[model samples]
Target: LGSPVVVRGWLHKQDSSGMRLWKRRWFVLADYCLFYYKDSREEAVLGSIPLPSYVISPVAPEDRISRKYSFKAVHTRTYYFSADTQEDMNAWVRAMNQAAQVL
Candidate 1:
């Protein structure tokens, strides 16, 4: 990779209610992996989604994500992230895609 990157946004992660309850997270994408925290300054990451196979993509009306961008790691995790705006989401998808290309 040319350089390391970081992104902040909202993530829809499942909760105790299983699929019915999706919690919002302070999502962070960086170093070819994804992370979340209480706030940007939090030293401890609550969780992470690694994209070794970085394959984030655009979505249609009928997709894994609604009003958000989705990234599915064929044999790994399925991530659905939402940004404040479309431009922000696109930037993240592009960044992830670019990171994927490097591998």
Candidate 2:
């Protein structure tokens, strides 16, 4: 609650390893960084992705991601996230893409 928050929402993130299982997490986008927590109120961040270093875009169909309403942030690793609805997913993608472009 310090810097200007761009967006905050619940998303299902794919596991880091080869399993590719999805785990729902709370994410906060602010200060050009994407911070994810175990819970919305969790004090410690489980992980953080710097926006400038990522390419944000919607996940393509027939790609590895089979879930609906999914988007991705690609860097050294491709981070996949699924939203509850198409609108929500698009909103997240727009905000992140804009933020990345600005910073």
Candidate 3:
């Protein structure tokens, strides 16, 4: 894919693992953790956000965190989206604030 991709939910987890059958192609899983980040944080005690039905692709390495963590360059995207309704956006912001408090 190219620039400006869109992902609509909270990112629960990210990883790269070799395929069990081929052992060559790498697989990336993006679990939708929750519809919103705030909800996910509030419910962290319950359990991890469940894996979503889809996953983004063309997963390539982009940046290197350095040898200490042993992570290589990885292609990824970070985005911010908001609802048209003020109430919804406000709620999201509130949830984000609450989530930050815990962090």
Candidate 4:
């Protein structure tokens, strides 16, 4: 029930604004929110996405994003991320799904 990490990995995120548009980030899943940091060693989180209301899914083949192993989280807003491999992408999706208690 506390903020113990459920999963973490390095991911390239399409930043929504607040800085350079695209940057690699360290993602941590916990407390029903996906938190990200500038680096794994960084003590402060750059931001967090509360997972419950968002639809998180892998990037569709027909979508505009061309990066392989990419996925997107959509609310009224959208967040994009690319993993190092398909397996890692699926792993993150699975962890996030469970963390959010979504199917």
Candidate 5:
């Protein structure tokens, strides 16, 4: 997440407004939390879902977010995220768990 561009990408974020079930978000992993912003410009961060939550798992192939290479992060609430590629999804899931172990 430091300089490799490994933990940063345009991920499809789950919305709460009920306007759009899924929307694009700029996700960048940080030391303490995984932050999501409105777009690439970094303007108006949507929120931060803290690292190493209770459970992080992949979206089943039959699920809505499945085709997007999605997964779920459970902390205070359930946050679903999907990356553009499978590679990105795996990376995100692994990174979150490893960071959680550190804590």
Candidate 6:
């Protein structure tokens, strides 16, 4: 929530509900936090940005909140091509995994 924490993900869909994108095929509610700050003057601008970083940690793990809650793998297909192609994906995956290991 400090500086911009950029996250790269796939664009899943788009419509009146705003853009639906995914990080590892996980559904991300991009504008979901707007209600919390609706009374603020910057609500319009703030809400325009993609999903905030803080929400991701909790969303990534729901079982901590409820014993019954569990993450089940869902099947979905995403194109494997980007402007940089698979090279970028491989590099990023390695870097992220390495960083996670250090932490």
TM-score sort, best first: 2, 4, 5, 1, 3, 6
Model 6 vs. true fold: TM: 0.24
lDDT of 2 by residue, 1-103 (tens): 5798999989899888877899999999999888999888958899988888678878766566888888888873778889999999988998888877754
* Collision pairs in model 1: none
Which lDDT value does model 2 have at 42? 52
Q: Could you give candidate 6's per-residue lDDT for residues 35-94 as a string of tens digits?
A: 112232323331232222222111125322221211211111111111124454454333
lDDT of 4 by residue, 9-80 (tens): 799998666852567889888888888888888478888899876777887666578778888877737788
**Candidate that would win on lDDT:** 2
Off by over 4 Å in 2: none
Q: Write the per-residue lDDT of candidate 1 for residues 1-103, one digit (tens) a residue.
A: 2435566666555443466455667766677777777665746779866666656655634544555443333322345555566776677777667656664
Model 2 residue 57 distance off true place after TM-score fit, in angstroms: 1.6
Models 1 onward score TM values of 0.65, 0.88, 0.26, 0.84, 0.74, 0.24
- Candidate 1, backbone clash total: 0
RMSD of each: 4.2, 1.9, 15.6, 2.7, 3.6, 13.1
The TM-score between candidate 2 and the true structure equals 0.88
TM-score of 5: 0.74
The lDDT, on a scale of 0 to 1, for candidate 6 is 0.25
Evaluated against the true structure, the overall lDDT of model 3 is 0.28
Clashes of 2: 0
lDDT by candidate, in order shown: 0.60, 0.85, 0.28, 0.81, 0.71, 0.25
| Candidate 1 RMSD to the real structure | 4.2
Which candidate has the highest TM-score of all?
Answer: 2
Selected candidate, larger TM-score, 1 vs 2: 2
